[PDB]
Design a protein around this ligand. Structure first.
Ligand SMILES: Nc1ncnc2c1ncn2[C@@H]1O[C@H](COP(=O)(O)OP(=O)(O)O)[C@@H](O)[C@H]1O
Ligand SMILES: [Ca+2]
Ligand SMILES: [Ca+2]
Ligand SMILES: [Ca+2]
Ligand SMILES: [Mg+2]
Lengths: 122, 351
């Protein structure tokens, strides 16, 4: 029933949400690739396979200064999204500065970080 | 909309509070005393006239009348919350039988009339509180310890290990070995003092045999503690011999494997293709994991046991004493929590 779940994984592309106050909030597309060190994010990459089905990779990205509610919520939302996608996503934990090559490769300009972030829900 | 209550049904202490807080506001002993009934600290206050029972002594509820008294005390005496007006998240032990879960659900819906509830596995909540969906949780509490492999959010029940060896055994073992110095702690009240000595002074040796050798060469090991009556007790190698029983349960006369061996055996019950992710995410949870030195010692011991091409990481979060509760607070705060719970109406018509 959550509106962002209903939008998740419908078309090939890249969807990024930030944990804000115990909710999953879309990131403005202009900010893609620039992550607040103070925050946690959930990223769904959807790929079209030639056979016609969609392939899903879920990454949760943890900033070095994100609060425990944010990192915890990002992990939980990742599990819940995977369940909504019928378990067909692969889950990946991404820590600031140690992200996988696959994750980095989603961003043509590479990954960048920014001071600050949204306030903790705790 | 409504705020959930979060109740972690600990073998030693209940941790309770409201969703969205960073720590439980209520922590009290999981004890019921009868000559009606007294719960928690007031029941200890009145040891002298009550018979005390631990209704969840090893993490599984065994006496439902006493457990209901604990839950009533939680809602009414601790939180001052109407349970019939709040969703409730309740925790359960790894490997809790489904029949026991069903009985707690019946009590919540039909004795407390909670409007909605969710039951979560303690170790899973702790893993989430660490910001992970995959890992193995070593949870060591008061009356029970478990190792719980979790993959992509879900515990793997064929690989969970239970140890009847946790903090209460360590308190009792410290009480025993202090007899070498002439102390005779034996009463309930004295056991609570020894528990505090354990928490203040004990630590885990990186290498037990070497620590025994270094400690006997000087009195640098000895550290002191002020008893309630003002006398000072001095403790030496008991500081690290007490929690050494986690690794060497033979010190307690138990044939069980230690916590390093148990962790290793749980990981090995999982298929080879996920073990790397478990070895790289060993997450400690619970009060009995709070000893200084534990992460370093576990790292050394599991590294020795595991294949040398594995990459062992032991994570010891600073707030791990209450990580179960904290994970429950996060989960029950999410905008999606409403879609996870079971409602009383549904239960009453098809439960
Ligand atoms: N700092 C500490 N060092 C060692 N043991 C501790 C510490 N703090 C608490 N404990 C022990 O942890 C146990 C309580 O842990 P907890 O996780 O609350 O258990 P449970 O959930 O089973 O009730 C007790 O045996 C207590 O003495
Ligand atoms: Ca933040
Ligand atoms: Ca999956
Ligand atoms: Ca080895
Ligand atoms: Mg516990």
């Amino acid at each position: 029933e959550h509106p962002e779940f209903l939008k998740a994984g419908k078309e090939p592309g890249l969807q990024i949400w930030r944990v804000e106050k115990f909710d999953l909030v879309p990131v403005p597309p202009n900010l893609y690739g620039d992550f607040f060190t103070g925050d946690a994010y959930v990223i769904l990459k959807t790929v079209q396979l030639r056979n016609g089905n969609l392939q899903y990779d879920l990454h949760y990205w943890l900033g070095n200064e994100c609060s425990q509610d944010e990192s915890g919520a990002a992990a939980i939302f990742t599990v819940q999204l995977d369940d909504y996608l019928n378990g067909r996503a692969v889950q990946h934990r991404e820590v600031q500065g140690f992200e996988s090559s696959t994750f980095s490769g989603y961003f043509k300009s590479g990954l960048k970080y920014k001071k600050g972030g949204v306030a903790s829900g705790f | 909309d409504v705020q959930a209550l979060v109740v972690d049904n600990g073998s030693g202490n209940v941790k309770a509070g409201v969703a969205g807080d960073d720590a439980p506001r209520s922590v009290f002993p999981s004890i019921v005393g009868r000559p009606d009934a007294f719960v928690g600290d007031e029941a200890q206050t009145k040891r002298g006239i009550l018979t005390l029972k631990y209704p969840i002594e090893h993490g599984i509820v065994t006496n439902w009348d006493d457990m209901e008294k604990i839950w009533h005390h939680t809602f009414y005496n601790e939180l001052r919350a109407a349970p019939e007006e709040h969703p409730v998240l309740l925790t359960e032990a790894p490997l809790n039988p489904k029949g026991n879960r069903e009985r707690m659900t019946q009590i919540m819906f039909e004795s407390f009339n909670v409007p909605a509830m969710y039951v979560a596995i303690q170790a899973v909540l702790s893993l989430y509180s660490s910001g992970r969906t995959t890992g193995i949780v070593l949870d060591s509490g008061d009356g029970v310890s478990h190792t719980v492999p979790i993959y992509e959010g879900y515990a793997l029940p064929h690989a969970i290990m239970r140890l009847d060896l946790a903090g209460r055994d360590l308190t009792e073992y410290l009480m025993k070995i202090l007899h070498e110095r002439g102390y005779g702690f034996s009463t309930s009240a004295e056991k609570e003092i020894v528990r505090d000595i354990k928490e203040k002074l004990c630590y885990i040796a990186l290498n037990f045999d070497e620590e025994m050798k270094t400690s006997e060469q000087s009195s640098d090991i000895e550290k002191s503690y002020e008893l309630p009556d003002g006398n000072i007790i001095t403790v030496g190698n008991e500081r690290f011999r007490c929690p050494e029983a986690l690794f060497q349960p033979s010190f307690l006369g138990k044939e069980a494997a230690g916590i390093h061996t148990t962790t290793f055996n749980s990981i090995k019950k999982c298929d080879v293709d996920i073990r790397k992710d478990l070895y790289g995410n060993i997450v400690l949870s619970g009060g009995t994991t709070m000893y200084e030195g534990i992460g370093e010692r576990l790292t050394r011991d599991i590294t020795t046991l595991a294949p040398s091409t594995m990459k062992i990481k032991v994570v010891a979060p600073p707030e791990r004493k209450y990580s179960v509760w904290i994970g429950g607070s996060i989960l029950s705060s999410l905008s999606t929590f409403q879609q996870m719970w079971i409602t009383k109406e549904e239960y009453d018509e098809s439960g």
